[PDB]
């Protein structure tokens, strides 16, 4: 079944025969028996092909090679035995192969390597021995053959490298030793490797820095990442000045010598992370071909003023997670395309810091203490796409030089109350601003080939043009405010001014009138604010919510509502007491206590942070999750509570059953107030539950409709459905006529 290519090359992989194929041409020069099921090669198995030149025995469960089996293969050059079950390197089986160039013995379960092994292999060039179970480096077999050029010993159980282990491999070029359990390296373990150009020590147990690598003058690639090493001392690479790449990541490092990375002329990258005991910039004299630089998580507070003028080919510069507070002048470097200064202590950006960086594309200044940026800091800076100054304390932001900026991030700068004109950022695609009102003028109706995405959204609780919204909601709010104000004033004047004796019920009615008047004053505040800023509210919300006016409006609203509810409960208690059968002074004291409680409830959100500024309505019931959950849940809890106690009380006298009249007035008051409180509580609770989805515009409209409505309604009922008021009005008219 062997597939013959006809070019003196034979393929026999995978057809499952357990012996050497027979009947093959005598002139063949390549033969493949991989994937087969050959376990042992009998004596003189390959004597039929004296012209063989490449042989592959991989995948076979082969675990024995006769000493004379591979004899007579003088012209063989490549021999692979990978994946097999050879328990030891075959010493007295490859002895006669005097013209072999490459030998694979990797992925076998090799435990021991006979000392006499590898004798006579005067033409070997590459050796594979990785993924084996060798406990120590075989010194004699390696010393046997001096012509080796590549060697790998990875994925093994070697723990220490003895002195002069590789003394005689003068021609070695590549040495792999990664994925091992090496933790101790002798001072002379790497002697004689004059031509070595690649050393791999990754994934080991090294804790102290290897002193041996000082004897590798031709080193070009060195890797020791994912080790235990912590200290890299000065003179680490002094003996190997041809280094190009060094891999040292995934290593817990504390201190790196100041002269560790000097005189490496062709080193092109440098990444150091976690070296927490470093406090000064490395001596980089002699290192001029650096393309990248990454010093992260250290205590460096300065950057050399000659870094830009030395590294001509610098392309990336990462200096985050340090204590850098003063920046040098970057004008020297032209190829620099990314700069990261994230999470540092920089407090100022001057116009000279970024002058002349003609190729800078990405700039990061997130999470620093910058409070002043020069107006022309980015003026002559070249074509930049990404800018990031998030989580600083910025008061103003420059405009010139940022027209071709695709991305901008300004979040976290709560003092940045200005507005960014969309004329400057004609090509911006993604924006982040501290306040949602700043992105209103930017995206317009989008949030004409704009596709501009702004991080803080304006979901009708941060209005762009009109605060109240549709015309009908503006008219009804205006009407509510007018009627509430006028009728509350009229009720107060009739009840209090024209009187000589104040019964408890009448005084309570007057107090509810006062609270409703305060609610109406809040509604008038809202109406005038909307009217003044009509179609331009995006220029007002930042000043409104983060100002004293919103605090005033929120306090007025909360105080009026709480006072009305508490006075409604006190009236329900007095009605019960009057129906039971002086205490008028006691009830006056109780009314003062209720007023004080309403005042303290209103004042409470002032010291707490993040409630009165949630919405331009200055209410503690905004859209979405309430930032101060506790305050809102308490307020609604104790409101529904007092509602249920007065409901229970009036149920009690209903069961129990002039003075008999006017009780229905208080009943209607409790009816209207409770049925108007339910929607506000329901739509404050709704955003907490993810099951119910409510459009924010409808929520805001209904809140604006029903929050102040009881203030509009109560004096209407007192003024039209109570003969008590008609008598008071007659008395007032009689007093006026006098």
């Amino acid at each position: 079944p062997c597939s013959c290519d006809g070019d003196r090359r034979v393929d026999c992989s995978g057809k499952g025969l357990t012996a050497v194929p027979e009947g093959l041409s005598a002139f063949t020069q390549a033969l493949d028996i991989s994937m087969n099921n050959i376990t042992q090669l009998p004596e003189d198995a390959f004597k039929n092909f004296p012209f063989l030149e490449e042989l592959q025995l991989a995948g076979n469960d082969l675990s024995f090679i006769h000493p004379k089996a591979l004899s007579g293969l003088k012209e063989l050059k490549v021999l692979t035995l990978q994946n097999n079950q050879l328990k030891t390197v075959p010493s007295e089986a490859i002895r006669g192969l005097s013209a072999l160039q490459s030998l694979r013995l990797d992925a076998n379960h090799i435990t021991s390597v006979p000392e006499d092994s590898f004798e006579g292999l005067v033409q070997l060039r590459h050796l594979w021995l990785d993924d084996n179970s060798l406990t120590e480096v075989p010194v004699h077999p390696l010393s046997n053959l001096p012509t080796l050029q590549a060697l790998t010993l990875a994925l093994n159980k070697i723990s220490s490298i003895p002195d002069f282990a590789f003394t005689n491999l003068s021609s070695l070029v590549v040495l792999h030793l990664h994925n091992n359990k090496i933790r101790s390296l002798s001072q002379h373990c790497f002697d004689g490797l004059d031509n070595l150009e690649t050393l791999d020590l990754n994934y080991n147990n090294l804790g102290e820095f290897p002193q041996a690598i000082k004897a590798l003058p031709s080193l070009k690639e060195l890797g020791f990442h994912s080790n235990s090493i912590s200290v890299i001392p000065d003179g680490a690479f002094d003996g190997n000045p041809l280094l190009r790449t060094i891999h040292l990541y995934d290593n817990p490092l504390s201190f790196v010598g100041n002269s560790a990375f000097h005189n490496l002329s062709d080193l092109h990258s440098l990444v150091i992370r976690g070296a927490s005991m470093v406090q000064q910039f490395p001596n980089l004299t002699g290192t001029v071909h650096l393309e990248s630089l990454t010093l992260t998580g250290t205590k460096i507070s300065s950057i050399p003023n000659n870094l830009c003028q030395e590294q001509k080919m610098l392309r990336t510069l990462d200096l985050s997670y340090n204590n850098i507070r003063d920046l040098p002048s970057f004008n020297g470097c032209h190829a620099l395309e990314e700069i990261s200064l994230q999470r540092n202590q920089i407090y100022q950006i001057k116009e000279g810091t970024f002058q002349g960086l003609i190729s800078l594309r990405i700039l990061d200044l997130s999470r620093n203490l910058i409070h002043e940026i020069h107006s022309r800091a980015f003026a002559t800076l070249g074509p930049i796409t990404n800018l990031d100054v998030s989580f600083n304390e910025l008061t103003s932001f420059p405009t010139e030089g940022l027209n071709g900026l695709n991305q901008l991030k300004l979040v976290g700068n709560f003092k940045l109350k200005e507005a960014l004109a969309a004329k400057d950022f004609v090509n911006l695609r993604s924006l982040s601003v501290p306040y949602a009102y700043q992105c209103c003028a930017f995206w317009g109706c989008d949030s004409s080939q704009i596709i501009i995405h702004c991080t803080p959204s304006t979901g009708a609780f941060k209005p762009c043009e009109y605060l109240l919204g549709s015309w009908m909601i503006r008219l009804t709010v205006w009407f509510i405010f007018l009627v509430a104000l006028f009728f509350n004033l009229l009720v107060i004047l009739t009840t209090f001014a024209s009187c000589t004796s104040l019964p408890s019920s009448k005084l309570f009615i007057g107090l509810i009138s006062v609270s409703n008047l305060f609610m109406g004053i809040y509604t008038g505040i809202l109406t005038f604010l909307d009217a003044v800023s009509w179609g331009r509210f995006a220029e007002f919300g930042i000043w409104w919510e983060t100002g004293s006016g919103c605090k005033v409006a929120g306090f007025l609203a909360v105080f009026s509502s709480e006072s009305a509810i508490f006075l409604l409960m006190l009236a329900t208690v007095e009605r019960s007491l009057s129906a039971k059968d002086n205490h008028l002074k006691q009830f006056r004291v109780a009314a003062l206590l209720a007023f004080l409680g309403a005042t303290v409830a209103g004042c409470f959100p002032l010291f707490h942070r993040g409630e009165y500024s949630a919405s331009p309505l200055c209410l503690p019931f905004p859209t979405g999750e309430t930032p101060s959950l506790g305050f809102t849940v308490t307020l609604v809890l104790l409101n529904s509570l007092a509602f249920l106690l007065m409901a229970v009380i009036y149920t009690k006298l209903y069961c129990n059953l002039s003075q008999s009249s006017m009780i229905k007035h208080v009943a209607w008051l409790i009816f209207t107030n409770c049925i108007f409180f339910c929607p506000v509580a329901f739509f404050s609770f709704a955003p907490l539950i993810t099951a119910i989805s409510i459009s924010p515009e409808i929520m805001k409209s209904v809140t604006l409709i029903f929050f102040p409505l009881p203030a509009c309604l109560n004096p209407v009922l007192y003024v039209f459905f109570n003969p008590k008021f008609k008598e008071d009005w007659k008395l007032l008219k009689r007093r006026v006529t006098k």
Partner: nanobody
Amino acid sequence: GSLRLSCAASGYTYSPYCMGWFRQAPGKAREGVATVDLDGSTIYADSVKGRFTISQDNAKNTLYLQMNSLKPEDTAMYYCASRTRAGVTCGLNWAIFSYWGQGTQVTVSS
């Protein structure tokens, strides 16, 4: 029971260096049951002491191995291996020995 396993030198004497006896299970690796080095030094594996003994002699250059305490699991393909190129140290693996015999197969009895 007990049985005699004798392996002799076909040509030039093989006693000048280490000679041993190996056993191979059907289809897997040859494993070494015993070995003897010049000067009479002998090495046995884990399941060999007390039930297998080996001795050379250079009088007529021949190895011999008394086997006893017969167990069912200890039935395999037995070979005698030799090495006369000197150097190195004696061992228990197959790779070291330069010469190999055709071997004898014995089945456990009683």
